[PDB]
């Protein structure tokens, strides 16, 4: 048993079988709970679930083939198995909250991609859409250990610690010293000598974040609103160290819409970037151009975080979920459509020891184990 709870926008049934378009309180998902999930991931009006068995299920908007079910137009209102992957044990799905493509990493290190093909983000030397998952041949000889997707580019990292990026080159998000689109996975040579252990990719005019095993956080790409974390707004196409987070013990990095977030081993949350609609959690909607601790969570040991487009979720070590940011569709889980300017306890989960959260563009997920 893993109980799964969902809330937020439900216009395309991206919550997997609830009635109503704005679910304002976390609601038990019997379809998703029945699956025994190890991971839920949220994309643009879409939801993906990876089970202990290693299968993948998807629901929500099917346009551009987000869901990898061989279709391209309508809605999948009930979570449906991506049967193209039924012969593999999938370990993780990577998708951005504002994304229309995704990747899947198997336990034996293979990477499949599917969905919108613009700018080569699927990694098959073309700009073609893929309605069904397709193996990224370029990575077949690398033992990939993690994956990440933005709205317009993608990334993967090997067990030796090398980082690959591909997709839209504009504004330097790929990190290769130019702005050239890569239809193929390309190694970030500037980071050799560092063992990269996570990577996160942003949306639209996007940033990229990387984390090394020594705790170093790097950022590059678009610089608007200070989401690179080094002040001002100048972009770059070469990875640069975010000096402020050195020595902080960062263990998880995420990119929402035009903002960045980091969580540390000791349980503190840092955010920076675009401030509009209170996505940063500092109580105001001003921009923050170097990382700043979310004071609203000081004293709470956060063990897992997730970012949507305009909202964030954080779980304490005691199973409590806090949310902050925009609430046009109920994604805050406070029973209303009122913004959470500061981190706020999510209603309706008491007695559920949540261990993990996930976000899509405008929806939210929490689950136990």
């Amino acid at each position: 048993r893993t109980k799964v709870f969902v809330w937020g926008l439900n216009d395309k049934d991206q919550l997997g079988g609830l009635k109503g378009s704005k679910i304002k309180v976390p609601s038990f998902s019997e379809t998703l709970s029945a699956l025994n999930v190890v991971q839920v991931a949220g994309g643009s009006k879409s939801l993906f679930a990876v089970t202990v068995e290693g299968k993948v299920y998807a629901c929500g908007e099917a346009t551009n083939g987000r869901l990898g079910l061989g279709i391209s137009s309508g809605t999948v209102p009930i979570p449906r198995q991506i049967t193209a992957l039924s012969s593999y044990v999938v370990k993780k799905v990577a998708v951005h909250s504002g994304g229309r493509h995704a990747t899947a990493l198997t336990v034996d290190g293979k990477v499949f991609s599917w969905g919108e093909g613009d700018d080569g983000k699927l990694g098959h030397f073309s700009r073609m859409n893929c309605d069904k998952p397709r193996l990224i041949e370029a990575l077949k000889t690398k033992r990939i250990r993690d994956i990440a997707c933005g709205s317009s580019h993608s990334a993967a990292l090997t067990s030796s610690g090398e980082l690959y990026t591909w997709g839209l080159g504009e504004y330097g998000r790929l990190g290769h010293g130019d702005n050239t689109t890569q239809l193929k996975p390309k190694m970030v040579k500037v980071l050799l000598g560092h063992r990269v252990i996570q990577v996160a990719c942003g949306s639209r005019d996007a940033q990229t974040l990387a984390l090394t095993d020594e705790g170093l956080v790097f950022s590059w790409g678009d610089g608007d609103f200070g989401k690179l974390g080094r002040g001002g707004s100048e972009g770059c196409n070469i990875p640069q160290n975010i000096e402020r987070l050195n020595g902080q013990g960062v263990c998880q990095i995420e990119c929402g819409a035009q903002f960045s977030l980091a969580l540390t081993k000791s349980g503190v949350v840092w955010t920076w970037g675009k401030g509009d609609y209170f996505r940063l959690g500092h109580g105001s909607d001003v921009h923050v151009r170097k990382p700043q601790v979310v004071e609203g969570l000081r004293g709470k040991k956060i063990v897992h975080v997730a970012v949507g487009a305009l909202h964030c979720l954080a779980v304490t070590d005691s199973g409590q979920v806090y949310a902050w940011g925009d609430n046009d569709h109920g994604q805050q889980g406070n029973g209303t459509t009122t913004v959470n300017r500061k981190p706020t306890l999510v209603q309706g989960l008491e007695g559920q020891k949540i261990t993990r959260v996930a976000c899509g563009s405008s929806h939210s997920v929490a689950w136990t184990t």
Partner: peptide
Amino acid sequence: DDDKDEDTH
């Protein structure tokens, strides 16, 4: 907000 979803109802 470019990154706000619309509720298609």
